[PDB]
RNA sequence: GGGGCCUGACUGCGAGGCCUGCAAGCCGAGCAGGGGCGAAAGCCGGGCCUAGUGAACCGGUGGUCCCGUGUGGAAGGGCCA
RNA sequence: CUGGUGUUGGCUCUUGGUCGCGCCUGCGUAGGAUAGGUGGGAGCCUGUGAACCCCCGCCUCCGGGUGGGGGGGAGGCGCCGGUGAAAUACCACCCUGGCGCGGCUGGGGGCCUAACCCUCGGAUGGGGGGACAGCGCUUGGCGGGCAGUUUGACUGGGGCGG
RNA sequence: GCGUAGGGUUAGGCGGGACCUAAGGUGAAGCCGAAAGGCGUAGCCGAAGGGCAGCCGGUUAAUAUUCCGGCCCUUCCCGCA
RNA sequence: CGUAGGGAAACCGAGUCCGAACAGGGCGCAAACGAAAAGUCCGCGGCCGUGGACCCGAAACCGGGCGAGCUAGCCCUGGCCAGGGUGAAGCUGGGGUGAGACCCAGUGGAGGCCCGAACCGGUGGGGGAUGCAAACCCCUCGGAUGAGCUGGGGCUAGGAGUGAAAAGCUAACCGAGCCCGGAGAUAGCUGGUUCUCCCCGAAAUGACUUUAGGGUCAGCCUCAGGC
RNA sequence: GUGGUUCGUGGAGCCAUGGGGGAAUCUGGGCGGACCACCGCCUAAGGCUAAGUACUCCGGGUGACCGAUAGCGCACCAGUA
RNA sequence: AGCCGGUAGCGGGCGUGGAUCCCUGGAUGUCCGAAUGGGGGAACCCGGCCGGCGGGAACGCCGGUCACCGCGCUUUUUGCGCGGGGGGAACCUGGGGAACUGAAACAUCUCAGUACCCAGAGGAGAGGAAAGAGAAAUCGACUCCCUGAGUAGCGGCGAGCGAAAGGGGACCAGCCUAAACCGUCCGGCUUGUCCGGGCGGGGUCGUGGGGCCCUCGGACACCGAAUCCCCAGCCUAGCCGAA
RNA sequence: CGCGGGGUGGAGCAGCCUGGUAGCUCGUCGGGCUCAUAACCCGAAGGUCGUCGGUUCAAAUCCGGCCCCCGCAACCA
C-alpha cells in the first residue's frame, strides 16, 4: 500500500520532537523548559518477508513486529493453483 | 524459536527431538532449506501423535515376534530322513525346515536368517536360533525311517 | 579614649505616628517570656546619624503541629527559617 | 556524523568484567635460616611411602620457592630455648596479585552464505557485496542551507558619546 | 467594416482525420506515497517534421486544384487471365 | 445567591489567627417608633469585562488553488541571413638541400574576419509627456555564418522556478506573482462622529512605566447620598 | 518516543499508540491519580443497535423583518453584461 | 368551459362523445458529462462483434453488445453473477493541519484542533450495554439539554485555558459472535484417538458464565423483535362552504 | 554545592603499586682543565615530601574530614 503493514495495518503516526533545556525539577532542578516543539512522523519498522509458497515466491511488507504471522499464514496450504497473487487468499480470508 | 527437526544436525541434534535456535537461522536457513518446522501447537501435537504411532508399533513389532517366539519353544519337529547311519544322503536346509514346520505344526518362517550356514547333513541333535531383533531358539531332531 | 565582667546583631507582639499615588521605607514607648551589666535608679531587641541594595514567580536547604485523592502509609505539597 | 538496538544468521579465534569452589605468590642482620594479616596453637607428616638424589614444569629480592614421573625403604619437622614488632609444624577465615575450571558475560579479528543489496538477453537460478550497507525506533553531536524572533530609554532631531 | 432583411462557403487528388512517429504527455507490468497523489519499460496520444493520387482554362453580384470543360492519377471490394 | 466569620490547612466558631499566654494586635459579631429594611428577583439607566465592540484605513502573515499565450531557460521540429571585400590551411608547380625545414608563384575559399540591406538591437541627440504610444516618432549609431535570428510543438513557479548576474524576469508596479479564503488580521497612529435648550466646568503636574505623542495610581471637573 | 484528557514533565496515574522485550485463562486479568498492603469496582484485546441530537438545496407558515442606494449580488431573462 | 406557453398579430385548428390545465405512473429521451468499446483540445473523432437496411462485397446507416475494480461462485478468472465509480446547501466522522493575532516585544503558551486540504457515511453521522465511573457498601449503555462551574484544576502559576462525578430533564431496547465439547465436507498426510481450512450444531457471562460428564421430573404455558405482512393515519391534485 | 583527579628542594615532574632509597633535571657555591667561556667532570649545600587524627615494627608510600589550585560535566529564580 504505502509504508503500511499488510498484516497489522500499522501505519506511520505523527509525533512531536520536543527539545528540552533544563534540569529535572525532581533533581533540585528549578524546572524543565521547552525550546522547540515540531512535527515528525514515526514510521513502522517495515521489512520484506519473501516466502516460497506452493507455486511461486510471495513477498510481504510486514512490520518487523508481526513477522512470524507470515510463517503462521504459510502453514495454511490448499488450492495450489494460479499466479503469485495468492496473497489475496493468504490475506484476511485467512483471519476471516 | 522452537523448531522440530528432520535429520541430524550435529549439536542441535537428530531426527525430531525439539530445540530452539536464533530466529534468523530458522526463517532463512532451517525452514527455507526444508529441514525443520516451528513447533506450532498443531505441529507440536501432530508429532506427539506420531511418536506413539511408531513407538506402539515398535512396542508391537516387538510383540508380534515374541508372541510366536513364545509359542515355538514348546514343540519339537522330527526329520525322518532316508539317512542310513550318522550321515544324511540328502540334507536339511532352512527351506526344508520351513516345510517341516509348515505342516508338522502349521507355521511359516523367513526361512532365511536362521543360523544355517552350510545346510545340515549328519543325523543327530540340533538347536538353532531365529530372528527378528529379539529372537528365538528352536530345537529339532533328525531321525531315520524308510 | 581605656578597662571590667557580658552577647538584647533576643523570642512573642506593638499603642501611636513621620513619610507616602500604590508598593515600600522610617521612628517607637509599653506589656509577656527568658536574660545581660549595674549597689540600685535604670539601660540593652547592634554600631553618632543619614548610602552598603532587589517585589513577585521558579526552585534548594533545615525543621514543624497541617493537608496525603477508597483506607494505613508513601509520593508531593503547604507552614516557619 | 554517530552509540545502542530491530530487520540479523552460521563456524570459529580472542580477550575484558563479575562471582563461587580449588590452587596460590608476599622475604633488611634478625627464638635456627629467604614467615603476607591476626586467631587457633602440643604437635604433627609417612604407610603404600619419610630426607637425599634422577630429571621435568613454574616463579624468581636467583637466594630460594614449588608441583609432577621416579629412584625412594622411612624419619622429615615442632616449640621452650628470644641480641627481630610477629613467629615460622599445622587447619582455617581473609586481604594481595596470579593461574585454572565452571557459571554469567561485554570488546575485538577472521571465515562462511542463506537474509538484505547490486548484477546476469536466460532465473524455485548464476556471479559479486555481505550480516556490513540500507531502512525502523532511539542517544549525543556539527549545522545561516532554511525558519521564527530579539537587537532599551533619555537625548536642545537622530546617531556617536555620556 | 453601422441598423433591418435575403442570399452566399460544393473536394477520392488542396489541408487535417478512418497513416507514421518527435520532444512531451499518458500508462497495463511494476514501484512509492498519511489521503489527494507521485513515478514508470511496453503500449497508446501527440506535427509546420516522414508518407500520400491534380494540372491548365471557363463560369458567379459573392465559391471553385471544390461546380463545369478538357486531359491525368490513387486507393479499397468483386470478378476473370 | 443570602442567612458566619476567622484559618495555608487540621479545625474552631460569636469568634478565630499568630502566640507559653487569661499580653497584645489582625480580620470579624451588636433593633429605628406595627411601619420601614438585610437580602434577593424582574425592569430601566451609567460604566467595565469578553466578543470585529464607535466607524473607515495598512505595509505585511499564513492555507488551498490559478498562471511560462508576456518574459527567462532548455527540449523536439522546421525556416531565414541582398550584395560586395580580405584571402588561412591544403593541394600543385618551381627553387633549395645529402635528405630536409623553408622561400616563391598559381589554385583554393577558411574565419564568434571586413563594408553593408533584410532581420535582431537600442549609442548619442532632438521631439513627445492629460502623447500616435501606460516606452512611440525622426536623425545618428551597434551586430549582421554565429555564443546568429526565428515559426510551430513542448517542460520547469511562489521561499519555488529561470537567470552570460541586474535582486533581472516569472501576463503593463517582483528584496518574494496572482486569486479566493483565515478576515471585520493587527494599527499605543491619521481621519471622521449627525437634533435642541438649561446648570456646572477642567488639564497639559507628580509617581512608576523597553515609558516619553501610550498608559496605571494621585491631583484638578461633575453627579448622587450623608455630615 | 508521543497524542488525548483541566494536566505545559509535573508526585502524572487513566485511554490511545510508532520502537524494544514479551504472559497467563478464576487460585486468570485491567482499574480506584506515582509506588506497597488492605478493602473494593470491573471483565480488554471480535461486531451491530433504533429514539432523544445537527443542518437547511427544497415546501409551508408566522413577523414592534426591508421597501428598489434598502432587502440575497440579482423584485426586471444575473452569477448575466 | 374554455384552449392552442411568456405574447399580441398573421395563418390555421381543438373542446359537454368533458379540451387546455393540475396529480400519479408509464413511454420516447440526439450529443457531452463518473462517462464506462477506443481516442480526444467536454458536447467531437475512430472501431470489434451479432442482427438489420440500400443494388450492397468495398461505402454508409440503424438496433444491440464490449471500460476498469472489488467480491462470491466455480475447472488457473477461457465465463456468469451482484456490487463499486460520480454529485449533493449546510450538518457528520475520520485522516492531515496554518497563520495573522493575544501575550501591549517574543521563543513555551495563545489564536486552535479553528481556517483549510483529503477520504468516507448518510438522511442524519458519530457514540453506544462497562476491563465504566468514584466514595454514598453507591450509581448503572450511549447521545442531547439544564445545572454542577468559570468550581476542581491547568498555566513563561504570565496572557490565558478549563473539566468530571452528581442532580434535574428529552429519549429509552439491547443483541449476534470467536473459544471449549459434538457433527461434518473436502483436504494434506510422516492414515490418524492427528493436523487443518469451509459449513452446521453448541455458547456468549462478573453476584462470574459456559463446555463435558452425574443426579433432577421438566413443561411450551409464557416471552417475542430492530425482519417481513396487512391496516388506520399522513404526503403527492382537489371540494363544499352562511349572510 | 556535588564527582574525577592534584598541592615532593627556589620551578616542575617519579615515590599515590604489593607500608623497610626522597631522588632526577636546570639554576646558584668551592674546585680542576681551557687565554677564556658555555660546555664537561667533581663535591656540597635546599624537601615539615598539602593538613590533623589514627591502624600498626616503622610510613612521604593506606584512611577520614580538612585546604587551595587545577580538573568534571552540570547548573542558574
Ligand atoms: K527477510
Ligand atoms: K539470487
Ligand atoms: K546495520
Ligand atoms: K535643536
Ligand atoms: K515518459
Ligand atoms: K502531418
Ligand atoms: K481580638
Ligand atoms: K466602571
Ligand atoms: K512567495
Ligand atoms: K495578472
Ligand atoms: K498525564
Ligand atoms: K489497558
Ligand atoms: K476506576
Ligand atoms: K471500575
Ligand atoms: K448508528
Ligand atoms: K436610482
Ligand atoms: K447590489
Ligand atoms: K371525467
Ligand atoms: K457500434
Ligand atoms: K477534521
Ligand atoms: K506565533
Ligand atoms: K502589542
Ligand atoms: K512585534
Ligand atoms: K488547545
Ligand atoms: K455459530
Ligand atoms: K477436526
Ligand atoms: Mg526527540
Ligand atoms: Mg514549533
Ligand atoms: Mg507554535
Ligand atoms: Mg518483537
Ligand atoms: Mg533476536
Ligand atoms: Mg502602626
Ligand atoms: Mg545584679
Ligand atoms: Mg514569570
Ligand atoms: Mg496525617
Ligand atoms: Mg490513601
Ligand atoms: Mg523483534
Ligand atoms: Mg567474506
Ligand atoms: Mg546471490
Ligand atoms: Mg545556529
Ligand atoms: Mg534569518
Ligand atoms: Mg509572529
Ligand atoms: Mg532583550
Ligand atoms: Mg529613543
Ligand atoms: Mg544631538
Ligand atoms: Mg548610543
Ligand atoms: Mg552608548
Ligand atoms: Mg463592403
Ligand atoms: Mg450591413
Ligand atoms: Mg476530385
Ligand atoms: Mg476527379
Ligand atoms: Mg470508415
Ligand atoms: Mg495520428
Ligand atoms: Mg502510434
Ligand atoms: Mg504520471
Ligand atoms: Mg506534411
Ligand atoms: Mg493530400
Ligand atoms: Mg498534372
Ligand atoms: Mg483556375
Ligand atoms: Mg473573392
Ligand atoms: Mg474537374
Ligand atoms: Mg478588634
Ligand atoms: Mg500555497
Ligand atoms: Mg512562451
Ligand atoms: Mg519561449
Ligand atoms: Mg524574405
Ligand atoms: Mg555573399
Ligand atoms: Mg554576405
Ligand atoms: Mg561578421
Ligand atoms: Mg558590418
Ligand atoms: Mg521581434
Ligand atoms: Mg536586450
Ligand atoms: Mg535613443
Ligand atoms: Mg529623450
Ligand atoms: Mg545600422
Ligand atoms: Mg561600423
Ligand atoms: Mg565590428
Ligand atoms: Mg548554432
Ligand atoms: Mg522558437
Ligand atoms: Mg508554445
Ligand atoms: Mg502555492
Ligand atoms: Mg502560498
Ligand atoms: Mg541571457
Ligand atoms: Mg513585470
Ligand atoms: Mg482570526
Ligand atoms: Mg480592517
Ligand atoms: Mg503587529
Ligand atoms: Mg462660571
Ligand atoms: Mg495628545
Ligand atoms: Mg505612543
Ligand atoms: Mg486617572
Ligand atoms: Mg451633596
Ligand atoms: Mg498535550
Ligand atoms: Mg502527556
Ligand atoms: Mg497500566
Ligand atoms: Mg494503578
Ligand atoms: Mg488510591
Ligand atoms: Mg465485547
Ligand atoms: Mg458503529
Ligand atoms: Mg418600512
Ligand atoms: Mg408597508
Ligand atoms: Mg438592489
Ligand atoms: Mg424611488
Ligand atoms: Mg431562466
Ligand atoms: Mg386567429
Ligand atoms: Mg409524468
Ligand atoms: Mg439524430
Ligand atoms: Mg474517456
Ligand atoms: Mg468515449
Ligand atoms: Mg491516430
Ligand atoms: Mg454487418
Ligand atoms: Mg444482402
Ligand atoms: Mg452501431
Ligand atoms: Mg450500438
Ligand atoms: Mg450497457
Ligand atoms: Mg462520494
Ligand atoms: Mg472524488
Ligand atoms: Mg455516495
Ligand atoms: Mg481530527
Ligand atoms: Mg483516511
Ligand atoms: Mg503582541
Ligand atoms: Mg443513527
Ligand atoms: Mg467541586
Ligand atoms: Mg461545559
Ligand atoms: Mg435502562
Ligand atoms: Mg463454527
Ligand atoms: Mg446458533
Ligand atoms: Mg465455575
Ligand atoms: Mg365557494
Ligand atoms: Mg360566499
UniProtKB/Swiss-Prot annotation, chain A:
GO biological process: translation
Record field: transmembrane: none
GO cellular component: ribonucleoprotein complex; ribosome
One Gene Ontology term of the molecular function aspect: structural constituent of ribosome
Domain of life, per lineage: Bacteria
Pfam families attached to this UniProt entry: Ribosomal_L28
InterPro entries from the UniProt entry: Bacterial_rp_bL28, Ribosomal_bL28, Ribosomal_bL28/bL31-like_sf, Ribosomal_bL28_bact-type
Keyword terms, alphabetized: Ribonucleoprotein, Ribosomal protein
Stored Gene3D superfamilies: 2.20.150.30, 3.30.160.850
Alphabetical list of HAMAP family matching this protein: Ribosomal_bL28
Assembly notes: Part of the 50S ribosomal subunit.
Family indicated by similarity: Belongs to the bacterial ribosomal protein bL28 family.
Name by which UniProt lists this protein: Large ribosomal subunit protein bL28
Lineage, top ranks: Bacteria, Thermotogati, Deinococcota, Deinococci, Thermales
Recorded name of the encoding gene: rpmB
From Swiss-Prot, chain B:
Gene Ontology BP term (one): translation
A Pfam family: Ribosomal_L9_N
UniProt keyword terms in alphabetical order: Ribonucleoprotein, Ribosomal protein, RNA-binding, rRNA-binding
InterPro entries in the record: Ribosomal_bL9, Ribosomal_bL9/RNase_H1_N, Ribosomal_bL9_bac/chp, Ribosomal_bL9_C, Ribosomal_bL9_C_sf, Ribosomal_bL9_N, Ribosomal_bL9_N_sf
GO cellular component: ribonucleoprotein complex; ribosome
MF terms (GO), sorted A to Z: rRNA binding; structural constituent of ribosome
The protein's assembly and partners: Part of the 50S ribosomal subunit.
Family under the similarity heading: Belongs to the bacterial ribosomal protein bL9 family.
Protein name: Large ribosomal subunit protein bL9
Amino acid at each position: 500500500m504505502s509504508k503500511v503493514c499488510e498484516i497489522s495495518g500499522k501505519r506511520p503516526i505523527v509525533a512531536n520532537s520536543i527539545q528540552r533545556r533544563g534540569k529535572a525539577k525532581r533533581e533540585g532542578g528549578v524546572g524543565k523548559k521547552t525550546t522547540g516543539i515540531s512535527k515528525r512522523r514515526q514510521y513502522p519498522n517495515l521489512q520484506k518477508v519473501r516466502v516460497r509458497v506452493a507455486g511461486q515466491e510471495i513477498t510481504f511488507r510486514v512490520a518487523a513486529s508481526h513477522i512470524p504471522k507470515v510463517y503462521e499464514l504459510v502453514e495454511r496450504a490448499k488450492g495450489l493453483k494460479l499466479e503469485g497473487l495468492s496473497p489475496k487468499e493468504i490475506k484476511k480470508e485467512l483471519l476471516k | 524459536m522452537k523448531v522440530i527437526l528432520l535429520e541430524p544436525l550435529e549439536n542441535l541434534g537428530d531426527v525430531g527431538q525439539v530445540v530452539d535456535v536464533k530466529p534468523g537461522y530458522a526463517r532463512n536457513y532451517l525452514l527455507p532449506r526444508g529441514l525443520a518446522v516451528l513447533a506450532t501447537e498443531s505441529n507440536l501435537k501432530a508429532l506427539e501423535a506420531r511418536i506413539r504411532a511408531q513407538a506402539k508399533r515398535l512396542a508391537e513389532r516387538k510383540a508380534e515376534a515374541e508372541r510366536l517366539k513364545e509359542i515355538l519353544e514348546n514343540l519339537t519337529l522330527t526329520i525322518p530322513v532316508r539317512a542310513g547311519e550318522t550321515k544324511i544322503y540328502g540334507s536339511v536346509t532352512a527351506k526344508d525346515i520351513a516345510e517341516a514346520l509348515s505342516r508338522q505344526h502349521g507355521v511359516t518362517i523367513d526361512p532365511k536368517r536362521l543360523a544355517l550356514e552350510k545346510p545340515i547333513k549328519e543325523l543327530g541333535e540340533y538347536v538353532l536360533t531365529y530372528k527378528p531383533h529379539p529372537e528365538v531358539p528352536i530345537q529339532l531332531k533328525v531321525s531315520v525311517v524308510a
